[PDB]
């Protein structure tokens, strides 16, 4: 999945213009993603790891 360009994007829009993008046709290993402590906040509602 194109997470590299999402995390390394130069410019982001304002709060009133939050971007919505469909994530599909790609496979990523979220396990390593949530195994790290890089993200200050990681909260899941309605699902379990």
């Amino acid at each position, epitope marked *: 999945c194109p997470f590299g360009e999402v995390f390394n994007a130069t410019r982001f829009a304002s709060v009133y213009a939050w971007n919505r993008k469909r994530i599909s046709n790609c496979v990523a290993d979220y*396990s*390593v993603l949530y*195994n*790290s*402590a*890089s993200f*200050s*906040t990681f909260k899941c509602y309605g699902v*379990s*790891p």
Partner: antibody
Amino acid sequence: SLRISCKGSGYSFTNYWISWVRQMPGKGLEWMGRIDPSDSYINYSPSFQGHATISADKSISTAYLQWGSLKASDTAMYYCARGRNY
Amino acid sequence: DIVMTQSPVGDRVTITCQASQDISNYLNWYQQKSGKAPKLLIYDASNLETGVPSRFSGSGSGTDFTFTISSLQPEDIATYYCQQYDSLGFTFGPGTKV
């Protein structure tokens, strides 16, 4: 549900580190996690399984602990005290 | 995933630390007392945080590291944990309990 709270007073909570200790009877020291208020740095135990996570509220100086799925080993007493200065 | 395996009063006891890949000198050490919690003392193996005694030192490079006590003391009983960090994340080992 059961909630356990341990709130200090008379001193700056953000200026004094707070750590949690888990020790059920018949076992040794099993650390789980510590938080750095400056950057929310979380260090995990060597035998971590993603059971419980620590969170704090700077607005009200209150720390909350929740369990994703309570099990038998969660029934234990916890040690809380003011830590070393800085 | 990545799987890691480790083998195996006053006697010579030596422990080793292993990592999935080469970590150069990016190592961490812990100090544990009877009633106390583990605390970060040295980070990057080149900066001594204020208040930490200077008697603690390390040597070696690459994939082999050794821990040696110059003089064992009754107050020196502790369990040491080894932590490594890389550009991807943080991986922990089972460790050894005394």
